[PDB]
C-alpha cells in the first residue's frame, strides 16, 4: 500500500501545514539547546533575617510537601525549577590545579544550593512520595544527585540531622516500597517487543521492557552518593533505624532486588542460549541490564566501603 | 381588568395596537411598591413587540391599551401577568405586578 500512499504535493493544505509544523517542532525544538538554567539560578541567586529567593522557594516547597495530602500534584513549576537547578550544579591531561579548581567550583555551587535547605526538601518530598513512582520521584532524585554530587559531607551531615530530628518512619518505608516495585527484565515483555518490531513501525503510518531502567539507574546513583564518602554514621543509620520506631533494613531489600535482576538476566540468557547471533534489540536490552547491574554493584560497594 | 391611571398625558390619537414593535420605558412595581424591574435601572428603554406576544399577556395588554406618546400607571393583576408563582426570585408569590410603562416611540 506504500505505492498507493497519498503524496505530499496532492493533499489538503491544512493537513500539510500541521504535519510540517509538527515535524519542524520535533526536529528543532527538541534538538534546540538552551543553557539559561545556570543563567537563571545565578541571576535569581543574586539576593540583591531576610531569606533569599532560593531560600523562600525551598521553604515554600518544603511546606507544600509537609502537608499530609497523601497525593502529589502535577507541579509543573516544580519540574521546571528542579530541572533548572539540578542542571545548574550539573554544570560539572588536566593537572592537579585544574582539578582542584573544578572541585572548588562544584563545592561552591553545591553550598549555594545547599545552605538554603535543599536536603530538607529532598527528604520531605521523598517521605511524602509514599513509594509512588512517577515524575515527582524522578525530579526529586535528579535534584538530589545534583545536590549530593561529589560526596559532599555537609549535605550528608544535614540529612542525618534532619532524619534524627524528624524521626519519621515514612522515608524508609517510602524508599523501600519505591525501589521494590522497580521493573526488571521480562521474557514475556521482550517477546512482545520483538513481535511488535516484526509488525513494522512503517505499518499504519521506546521499549516496554526496561522502561524505568534510567529511573533505577538514577535512584541507585543517588543511593550510592548517599553512601559515598565512607560516612559510617549514615551507613549505620541505613542499616538499622535505631532512632525511628520502625527499622527498615535497606540491605536486605536491595539484595532481594539484586536477586530479581539476576533471575531476569539468567532467564534472558537461557532464552538467548539457543540463538548464537544476538539481536540488536537483545543487545540493547543486555547493555541496559548491564548498566543497571553496574550501578547496583557500585552502590553495594559504597555500602560496604570502609571498615 | 387592567387598571389605568395617567401620570404624564400626551398624544392620544396615535395607538401602538397596529402590530409593530414599540420602544417603551417600561418599569415594574411590586405589591408594596418595590421597583423589581425598571427601564431606567437597566439604563436602556425596553423594546416591546405588539402582536408577537413575546411579553406576558397582561403586560402586552396593558402596553397596547395605553396610547402612543402618553404615560400611565398600567397596573395589572398578577393572575394574568405572571400567575401565582411569578418570577422565581424577582417577583414574590401572590404579589401584584404593578407597571408604569411609558410610551416613547413606535
Amino acid at each position: 500500500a506504500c505505492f498507493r500512499m497519498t503524496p505530499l504535493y496532492n493533499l489538503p493544505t491544512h493537513r500539510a501545514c500541521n504535519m510540517f509544523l509538527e515535524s519542524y517542532k520535533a526536529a528543532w525544538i527538541l534538538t534546540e539547546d538552551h543553557s539559561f538554567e545556570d543563567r537563571m539560578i545565578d541571576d535569581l541567586s543574586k539576593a540583591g533575617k531576610k531569606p533569599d529567593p532560593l531560600h523562600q522557594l525551598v521553604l515554600h516547597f518544603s511546606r507544600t510537601a509537609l502537608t499530609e495530602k497523601s497525593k502529589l500534584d502535577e507541579d509543573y513549576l516544580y519540574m521546571a525549577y528542579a530541572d533548572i537547578m539540578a542542571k545548574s550544579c550539573h554544570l560539572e591531561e588536566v593537572s592537579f590545579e585544574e582539578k582542584e579548581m573544578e572541585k572548588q567550583r562544584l563545592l561552591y555551587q553545591q553550598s549555594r544550593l545547599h545552605t538554603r535547605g535543599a536536603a530538607e526538601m529532598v527528604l520531605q518530598m521523598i517521605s511524602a512520595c509514599k513509594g509512588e513512582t512517577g515524575a515527582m520521584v524522578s525530579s526529586t532524585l535528579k535534584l538530589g544527585i545534583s545536590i549530593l554530587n561529589g560526596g559532599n559531607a555537609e549535605v550528608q551531615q544535614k540529612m542525618l540531622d534532619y532524619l534524627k530530628d524528624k524521626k519519621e518512619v515514612g522515608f524508609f518505608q517510602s524508599i523501600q516500597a519505591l525501589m521494590q516495585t522497580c521493573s526488571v527484565l521480562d521474557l514475556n515483555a521482550f517477546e512482545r517487543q520483538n513481535k511488535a518490531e516484526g509488525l513494522g513501525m512503517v505499518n499504519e503510518d521506546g521499549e516496554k521492557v526496561m522502561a524505568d531502567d534510567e529511573f533505577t539507574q538514577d535512584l541507585f546513583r543517588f543511593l550510592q552518593l548517599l553512601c559515598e564518602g565512607h560516612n559510617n554514621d549514615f551507613q549505620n543509620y541505613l542499616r538499622t533505624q535505631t532512632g525511628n520506631t520502625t527499622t527498615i533494613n535497606i540491605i536486605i531489600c536491595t539484595v532481594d532486588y539484586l536477586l530479581r535482576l539476576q533471575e531476569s538476566i539468567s532467564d534472558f540468557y537461557w532464552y538467548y542460549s539457543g540463538k548464537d547471533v544476538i539481536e540488536e534489540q537483545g543487545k540493547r536490552n543486555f547493555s541496559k541490564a548491564m548498566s543497571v547491574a553496574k550501578q547496583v554493584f557500585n552502590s553495594l560497594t559504597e555500602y560496604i566501603q570502609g571498615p | 381588568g387592567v387598571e389605568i391611571e395617567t401620570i404624564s398625558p400626551g398624544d392620544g390619537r396615535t395607538f401602538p395596537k397596529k402590530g409593530q414593535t414599540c420602544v417603551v420605558h417600561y418599569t415594574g412595581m411590586l405589591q408594596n411598591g418595590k421597583k423589581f424591574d425598571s427601564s431606567r435601572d437597566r439604563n436602556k428603554p425596553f423594546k416591546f413587540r405588539i402582536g408577537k406576544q413575546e411579553v406576558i399577556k397582561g403586560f402586552e395588554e396593558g402596553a397596547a391599551q395605553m396610547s402612543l406618546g402618553q404615560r400611565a400607571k398600567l397596573t395589572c393583576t398578577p393572575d394574568v401577568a405572571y400567575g401565582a408563582t411569578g418570577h422565581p426570585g424577582v417577583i414574590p408569590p401572590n404579589a401584584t405586578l404593578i407597571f408604569d410603562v411609558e410610551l416613547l416611540n413606535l
Binding site: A1, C2, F3, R4, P12, G200, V202 | -
Partner: protein, 137 residues
Amino acid sequence: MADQLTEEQIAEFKEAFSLFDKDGDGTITTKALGTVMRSLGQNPTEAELQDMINEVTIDFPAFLTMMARKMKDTDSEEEIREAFRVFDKDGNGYISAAALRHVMTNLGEKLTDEEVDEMIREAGQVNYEAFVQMMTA
C-alpha cells in the same frame, strides 16, 4: 471506522446524511438511505443494501463506519491495482531482485536482504505473472 476514508468523501457523506435527516438522529431507514446515496451519484447494489439492512435509528458515524466497512473491499482492490501498476512500472512488467530492493527502499520499510530474497523466491528475475502474484500477495 473511516480513518482511511478520504476527507472529501466523508464531507459529502455528512452533507448527504444531514440533507436526508434534518433531525440529526439518523432516523432515515436503510432503504431511504440507499436511495439517497444512489441519488447522490453512488448507486448501491440491491444485494449489498439488503445485507446492510439485515446486519443493522443509528447516528451518522455508524452509517459512516458501515460504509467504510462495505468499501474496504474497494480500497483493497484499489491497493491491488496500485501494486500491479507499480510492478508494471519496471522492465517488461516484471520486477527483479534489484527492482524489488529499490521499491522496498522507496517505501521506507527498510526491508532486510533476507526478506527481499524471500519475496523474489516467492515471485532469477521474476516474470510479469510472478510480479502480479507478488503484488496480489
